């Protein structure tokens, strides 16, 4: 996350002068629709980082993670308190 933020900071000129011109306007992504091409439109560097991170890592490895989180919820219901910071960060990542 920190690397992506710093990276987005570092490519500022490329974002400002190149990407936005060919970027898809948010207006047509909402009411307009109008898109069905087999291409990935140019996006922000941070947008690339986060979208790719969702695409390539969390999708294959989600079922076991959610299963163990639900299981730990039962353990907390038993009374014992695991590390709240780790679980909170994991949930907030979603």
């Amino acid at each position: 996350s920190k690397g992506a933020d710093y990276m987005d900071c570092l490519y500022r000129y490329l974002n400002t002068q190149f990407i936005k011109k060919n970027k898809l306007t948010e207006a047509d992504l909402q009411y307009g629709y109008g898109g069905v091409d087999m291409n990935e439109p140019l996006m922000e560097i941070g947008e690339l980082a986060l979208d790719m991170w969702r695409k390539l890592m969390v999708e294959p490895l989600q079922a076991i993670l959610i299963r163990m989180l639900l299981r730990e919820i039962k353990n907390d219901r038993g009374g014992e308190d695991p590390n709240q910071k780790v679980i909170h960060g994991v949930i907030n990542s979603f």
Partner: protein, 92 residues
Amino acid sequence: MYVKLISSDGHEFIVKREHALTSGTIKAMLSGPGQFANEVNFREIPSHVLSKVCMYFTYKVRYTNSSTEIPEFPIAPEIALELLMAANFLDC
């Protein structure tokens, strides 16, 4: 509260940081691991144009939505092209 700018010429200009944060590029350069603690060096900008840029900073600082006529910013003929070039790399 004060930040140092170093040109390719070698001259060092100290400026109030609230003035300096007007330009987005400088803000982005400070952001990141280079927290500098400040001093900033540009390997290609000559001193005189950067001094004119600093005067632009302070002149914009003086008058913001101020009432009455705002004195125009004098421009030398030769340095006009250099200022146009240097506008991008600082994105002010």
